[PDB]
């Protein structure tokens, strides 16, 4: 599986049948159909103690991994019950500024999308979490092209170092707080992982407010390779999955 013409999202169902299930992700967020739910508590983002470890090119995206052996970077509140630990974050972007996000708002596409992945600490580890309906909580943040994001620059500069699939670089003392928008208003719905195995274990929390990044920040993203070193160069772009059918599910807003 990949994002190519022969291994793309349109093909995943062949190896991953769940691909055509009932609670697949990403989806189009219809703002006029979303239900304001007064019973939704505010989100609680505690990342003051975050411990980043490294960044790696997995051939489909770049992942920034965190030490999740203790409650150091956690998420709670909102529609969540219990504590969820930050394990990693990655992005999805396009070849152009007009595409790249997974989730869409009123059919509008953003330049990129950030996914913060967290797993429910009653399950003991990530692996057992993906087997539960309330196993993971992914925080989704949209990216628009405008003014640079100071907090993203540490990431940008390291990209050179993990150009091809399989490369990794030590990446400590990175503070994820530098990626958050001013407002914490969100949308939430039950969904799945954004890539194979496509497990339907995710509570999606998508922030209404996007962060801005400069054109040269995103450009650096697009310089990445899906291919491993010593192979034909295939630029890592359009690594995003198209919107899936809501299929009954209801999207709730905190505003
Ligand atoms: Zn993702």
UniProtKB/Swiss-Prot annotation:
pH dependence: Optimum pH is 6-8.
Disease: Osteopetrosis, autosomal recessive 3: A rare genetic disease characterized by abnormally dense bone, due to defective resorption of immature bone. Osteopetrosis occurs in two forms: a severe autosomal recessive form occurring in utero, infancy, or childhood, and a benign autosomal dominant form occurring in adolescence or adulthood. Recessive osteopetrosis commonly manifests in early infancy with macrocephaly, feeding difficulties, evolving blindness and deafness, bone marrow failure, severe anemia, and hepatosplenomegaly.
Organism: Homo sapiens
Domain of life: Eukaryota
Effect of substituting residue 102 to D: Normal CO(2) hydrase activity
Effect listed in the UniProt record for changing residue 58 to D: Strongly reduced activity
Quaternary structure annotation from Swiss-Prot or TrEMBL: Interacts with SLC4A4. Interaction with SLC4A7 regulates SLC4A7 transporter activity. Interacts with SLC26A6 isoform 4 (via C-terminus cytoplasmic domain).
Site (Fine-tunes the proton-transfer properties of H-64): 3, 58, 63
Name of the molecule in the record: Carbonic anhydrase 2
Reaction equations catalysed: hydrogencarbonate + H(+) = CO2 + H2O; urea = cyanamide + H2O
Cytoplasm listed as a keyword: yes
